[PDB]
């Protein structure tokens, strides 16, 4: 019993697609799913994906309502598909993966991931479900999370935060931290030591360190003198330059939080997706300085100092490799006469 009317019945009663039987009437008209409640037409789903409206409405249901890794973490690990679940990208308002395994007949390519066509793909397993660890050992290319310790395997501690129904949080009623594993052509590979993106919003920014709390509270001169930040040029990379028509640096999300509360500005998030690095179109109000492509990254302010306080200040120009979120991020460094001048994510 799998039908459009049955899916809408679960949406009207249990919120998401449970396993309950029953049907309610449905009207489809211009990428919108309607239902009749006491004689009125009520909207339930507005299609914004590249799929048919009835298929995406079935994929919006059955979505994973448990804490799952962020889409950027799954994309950096090369995950291509999900096993017996659907990871809903709450950004883009679309599924994070376009094909399914035993979920929706229109998007299904296999009933079970052990079929022959799923071998060259990177399948995503959730060890919190029974037997998923066994299928990961039998699979050829995959990624596994478990919350615990799987015998015989070496774990990699992942991000402390996770997305729950679109809300990125560090849970205490739940865990939201996973041990990551990965197989490539049958070989279990070692995930390298890495930094992690804090994933924070601009309008509800919160510090997470004593150094961060001081950065927001203290002035520009008082913060550089205490933590010994001379010559490393935090005035241009973090604070930002607004004197001329072109904006200076401003490549730390912490730099946007302090500036936003003192003077709002405009953001255009072209290419709206969840990437480790983000490019915004910035137009500073009050002043008028702007920049078309502004590469911004969110790191703990202590981590950015640890990265910059371990580089050779002698070379004029050098490409810097740093692994964040299980991928190599390229940085560009410029130095003059023993002090840096700029240090930003490479384009």
- Alpha helices (H) along 203-252: 210-217, 220-226, 234
Instruction: State how far the Cα of 251 lies from the Cα of 232, in Å rounded to an integer.
Output: 14
Q: Which of 146, 154, 162 is nearest to 72 (CA)?
A: 162
Q: Which of 91, 236, 258, 318 is catalytic?
A: 236
Question: Residue 216 is encoded by which pair of tokens?
Answer: 């927001």
Q: Quote the strand ranges of 146-223, DSSP E.
A: 156-157, 162-164, 167-169, 179-184, 187-188
Q: Is 283 annotated as a binding residue?
A: no
- Quick check: is 244 catalytic? no
Q: 260-294 burial, b for 16+ CB within 10 Å, e for fewer?
A: eeeeebeeeeeeeebebbbbbebbbeeeebbbeeb
Q: 48 vs 228, which CB is nearer to a second copy? A: 48
Q: How far is the CB of 125 from a second copy (least distance, A)?
A: 19
Instruction: State how far the Cα of 135 lies from the Cα of 215, in Å rounded to an integer.
Output: 48
Q: Is 45 annotated as a binding residue?
A: no
Question: Residue 56 is encoded by which pair of tokens?
Answer: 């995406």
Q: Which of 251, 261, 318, 339 is catalytic?
A: 251
Q: How far is the CB of 6 from a second copy (least distance, A)?
A: 7
Q: How far is the CB of 331 from a second copy (least distance, A)?
A: 18
Q: 138 vs 154, which CB is nearer to a second copy? A: 138
Q: 146 vs 279, which CB is nearer to a second copy? A: 279
Q: Is 111 annotated as a binding residue?
A: no
Q: How far is the CB of 223 from a second copy (least distance, A)?
A: 24
Instruction: State how far the Cα of 142 lies from the Cα of 144, in Å rounded to an integer.
Output: 7
DSSP string, 265-330: EEEE--S-S--SSEEEEEEETTT--EEEEEEEB---HHHHHHHHTTS-SSSSEEEEEEEBSSSEEE
Q: Is 293 annotated as a binding residue?
A: yes
Q: Which of 291, 309, 321, 339 is catalytic?
A: 291
- Quick check: is 1 catalytic? no
Q: Is 292 annotated as a binding residue?
A: yes
- Quick check: is 97 catalytic? no
Q: Is 342 annotated as a binding residue?
A: yes
Cα 303 versus chain centre, distance: 19
Q: Is 294 annotated as a binding residue?
A: yes
The strand pair at 328-336 and 167-169 is best described as unpaired
Would you put residue 159 in left (φ > 0), alpha (ψ -120 to 50) or beta?
beta
Q: 76 vs 84, which CB is nearer to a second copy? A: 76
Contact 196, 76 (CB under 8 A): no
Q: How far is the CB of 305 from a second copy (least distance, A)?
A: 27
Q: 75 vs 132, which CB is nearer to a second copy? A: 75
Q: 35 vs 84, which CB is nearer to a second copy? A: 35
Q: How far is the CB of 4 from a second copy (least distance, A)?
A: 5
Binding residues for uracil: 291-295, 342-346
Binding residues: 291-295, 342-346
Residues known to be catalytic? 236, 251, 291
């Amino acid at each position: 019993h799998m039908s459009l009317e049955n899916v809408a019945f679960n949406v009207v009663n249990k919120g998401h697609f449970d396993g309950q039987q029953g049907e309610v009437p449905v009207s489809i008209i211009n990428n919108t799913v309607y239902t009749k409640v006491d004689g009125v037409d009520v909207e339930l789903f507005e299609n914004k994906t590249t799929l048919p409206v009835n298929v995406a409405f079935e994929l919006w249901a059955k979505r994973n309502i448990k804490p799952v890794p962020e889409v950027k973490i799954l994309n950096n690990l090369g995950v291509d598909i999900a096993a017996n679940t659907v990871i809903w990208d709450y950004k883009r308002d679309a599924p994070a993966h376009i094909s399914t395994i035993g979920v929706c007949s229109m998007t299904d390519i296999a009933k079970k991931p052990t079929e022959t066509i799923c071998a060259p793909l990177t399948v995503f397993f959730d060890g919190r479900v029974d037997g998923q660890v066994d299928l990961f050992r039998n699979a050829r290319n995959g990624v596994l999370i478990t919350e615990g310790s799987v015998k015989g395997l070496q774990p990699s501690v992942g991000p402390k935060q996770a997305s729950l129904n679109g809300v990125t949080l560090i849970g205490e009623a739940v865990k939201t931290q996973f041990n990551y594993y990965k197989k490539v052509d049958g070989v279990v590979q070692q995930l390298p030591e890495t930094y992690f993106t804090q994933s924070r919003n601009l309008q509800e920014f919160k510090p997470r360190s004593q150094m961060e709390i001081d950065f927001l509270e203290l002035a520009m001169d008082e913060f550089i003198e205490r933590y010994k930040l001379e010559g490393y040029a935090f005035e241009h990379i973090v604070y930002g330059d607004f004197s001329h028509s072109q904006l200076g640096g401003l490549h730390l999300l912490i730099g946007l939080a302090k500036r936003f509360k003192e003077s709002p500005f405009e953001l255009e998030d072209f290419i709206p997706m969840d990437s480790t690095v983000k490019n915004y179109f910035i137009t500073d109000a009050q002043t008028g300085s702007s920049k078309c492509v502004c590469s911004v990254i969110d790191l703990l302010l202590d981590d950015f100092v640890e990265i910059i306080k371990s580089q050779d200040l002698s070379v004029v120009s050098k490409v810097v490799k740093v692994t964040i979120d299980y991928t190599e991020i390229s940085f560009m460094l410029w130095c003059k006469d023993g002090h840096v001048e700029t240090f930003y994510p490479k384009l």
